[PDB]
Amino acid sequence: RIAGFRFSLYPMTDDFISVIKSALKKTDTSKVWTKTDHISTVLRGSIDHVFDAAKAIYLHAANSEQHIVMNGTFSIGCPGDTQGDTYKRVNEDAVRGLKAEAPCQFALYPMNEPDYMGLIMEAVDIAKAQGTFVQGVHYASELDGDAHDVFSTLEAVFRMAEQQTNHITMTVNLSANSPS
Amino acid sequence: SRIAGFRFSLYPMTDDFISVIKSALKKTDTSKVWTKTDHISTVLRGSIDHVFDAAKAIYLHAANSEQHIVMNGTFSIGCPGDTQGDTYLSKGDKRVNEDAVRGLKAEAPCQFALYPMNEPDYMGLIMEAVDIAKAQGTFVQGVHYASELDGDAHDVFSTLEAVFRMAEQQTNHITMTVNLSANSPS
């Protein structure tokens, strides 16, 4: 049972290649198998390491004061998920002090799950409990607050679904330093 | 009744992003779709036809600014309890951006994932998607959690719609994420 996170970092600035390269340097991806191509980067490890690396990359990039967005898909349990390309929360210490607002829009997709609308509803209540929820929009749920919280919720919701359905995915759209 | 939707974001990797995004949307004729924009994304609602017409036009216009921009978003249709509002519907209208962007070009390397919900045979449909991509000559390969496409936007968007329609036909609720990179430095 391998967890993954195919994402992309989008820095809305002329020096985006720099911005990107930096955040991925300041992050201890020693706990996850990584691979990048022209369109995106995929992380494969445990739910812990993956959500660990993910929050670390967002925090760094966000602290660049640059308006940057993290867009990716968390996946686990894919039928026939190759048994390869895989590896404590290493970045936990380094990022503990880092702060950043994480307005987010996510969508949970429990696959071949008859009761999927129920799990999504549960997902919301989880976000309402954690105080991160904000509202529902077409095709997604809205969150906010500090990146440490938002990411807490995302992982909570992921595990909740993860424990009920074999194959689930969850897309996230986090906007760091939005102009507005 | 069965309204299609597209929630997306435009990511221009340039200091002049606010302008690039405004021009792409402004240059696109969005009269055949309901639209709503917030701090994170823009959502389009209407028929599969008008939604994909708008999506492709927006991509082509953004791409033709010669800046490195990315279109990331999700196509959805058939959501249980999906409201019947927030839409523009007119089966009798032709795609409004077709002639405007016909003469436009832009490479659309893309990574996408099909999600047929509550569908026991969802892995098979994804396989069908891969075969549509090949018969169209846009298939490049498969990667973890996604299928890859390449070629001009007209063909890539044509493939995405073919895939979307194939699945929409067999399953009630399906979503399809897309990640197209235009003018990438690579």
Side-chain angles (χ1 to χ4, degrees):
Chain A
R1 194 170 196 59
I2 312 170
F5 182 44
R6 176 175 287 304
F7 68 109
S8 289
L9 221 48
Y10 304 111
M12 265 51 73
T13 164
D14 273 75
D15 193 31
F16 62 96
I17 289 181
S18 160
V19 177
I20 289 173
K21 179 182 180 179
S22 177
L24 295 170
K25 169 64 125 53
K26 301 175 178 291
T27 300
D28 185 32
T29 61
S30 59
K31 292 294 173 289
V32 296
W33 174 92
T34 295
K35 178 174 173 46
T36 302
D37 63 11
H38 55 324
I39 303 167
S40 65
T41 295
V42 65
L43 312 178
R44 284 168 68 87
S46 69
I47 296 175
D48 300 87
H49 296 168
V50 170
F51 265 89
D52 169 58
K55 190 179 68 176
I57 298 179
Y58 181 78
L59 256 346
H60 289 322
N63 282 56
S64 75
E65 307 180 62
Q66 301 285 174
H67 170 46
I68 196 289
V69 175
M70 172 175 253
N71 206 307
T73 300
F74 283 100
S75 179
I76 187 172
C78 179
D81 183 19
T82 87
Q83 295 301 66
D85 313 326
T86 183
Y87 181 73
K88 174 198 176 183
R89 289 194 158 78
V90 289
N91 299 284
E92 215 167 3
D93 279 298
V95 78
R96 169 164 50 269
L98 286 50
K99 174 285 171 305
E101 284 298 295
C104 171
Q105 288 190 331
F106 74 97
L108 182 64
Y109 301 113
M111 307 312 289
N112 194 27
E113 173 54 70
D115 216 52
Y116 78 103
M117 291 301 274
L119 282 64
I120 295 172
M121 206 166 64
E122 208 174 311
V124 173
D125 289 323
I126 287 182
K128 288 191 174 174
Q130 301 215 341
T132 56
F133 184 66
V134 27
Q135 64 173 179
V137 299
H138 284 296
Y139 322 127
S141 295
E142 215 163 83
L143 301 179
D144 189 38
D146 174 70
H148 280 297
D149 293 312
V150 176
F151 272 81
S152 271
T153 305
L154 294 178
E155 181 183 349
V157 171
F158 191 72
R159 289 174 179 293
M160 172 279 273
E162 183 275 307
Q163 287 279 278
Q164 296 176 60
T165 308
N166 305 308
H167 181 197
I168 88 162
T169 69
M170 183 179 69
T171 66
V172 299
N173 199 347
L174 303 127
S175 187
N177 294 142
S178 176
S180 47
Chain B
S1 199
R2 193 177 178 59
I3 301 159
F6 185 47
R7 176 171 296 288
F8 72 93
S9 306
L10 278 182
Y11 301 115
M13 325 293 67
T14 164
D15 306 318
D16 214 58
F17 64 90
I18 308 167
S19 322
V20 174
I21 303 176
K22 182 187 180 67
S23 180
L25 287 172
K26 179 64 64 178
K27 290 195 180 195
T28 298
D29 183 335
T30 53
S31 63
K32 303 310 178 193
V33 296
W34 168 85
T35 66
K36 175 176 180 50
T37 304
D38 56 52
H39 58 304
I40 301 170
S41 55
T42 292
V43 62
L44 310 182
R45 280 168 65 83
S47 64
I48 297 179
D49 299 81
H50 299 135
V51 173
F52 270 95
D53 164 86
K56 181 179 73 181
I58 293 168
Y59 181 74
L60 281 163
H61 288 312
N64 273 61
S65 74
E66 284 175 57
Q67 296 290 74
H68 172 47
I69 51 80
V70 170
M71 175 179 269
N72 211 298
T74 312
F75 285 101
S76 179
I77 192 175
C79 184
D82 181 39
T83 159
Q84 297 296 71
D86 294 356
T87 197
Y88 174 85
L89 297 182
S90 190
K91 177 55 191 171
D93 300 329
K94 55 170 286 182
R95 314 205 172 195
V96 290
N97 293 286
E98 195 186 291
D99 304 321
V101 308
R102 188 181 74 262
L104 290 183
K105 304 279 294 180
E107 286 299 293
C110 168
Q111 278 179 338
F112 76 85
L114 180 59
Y115 299 121
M117 311 308 290
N118 187 5
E119 178 50 72
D121 183 48
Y122 79 111
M123 289 302 286
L125 277 62
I126 289 169
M127 228 312 98
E128 262 186 279
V130 173
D131 293 315
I132 286 167
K134 297 179 187 175
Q136 283 209 41
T138 52
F139 182 65
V140 322
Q141 73 185 306
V143 304
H144 290 298
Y145 323 130
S147 296
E148 199 170 300
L149 306 173
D150 194 50
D152 182 65
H154 289 280
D155 296 301
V156 168
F157 272 98
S158 173
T159 286
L160 293 171
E161 180 175 355
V163 176
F164 196 68
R165 285 179 181 282
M166 171 261 108
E168 160 278 294
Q169 284 288 304
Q170 288 149 47
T171 312
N172 262 305
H173 180 197
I174 76 148
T175 62
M176 181 179 229
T177 65
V178 297
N179 193 346
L180 302 91
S181 195
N183 304 138
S184 57
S186 293

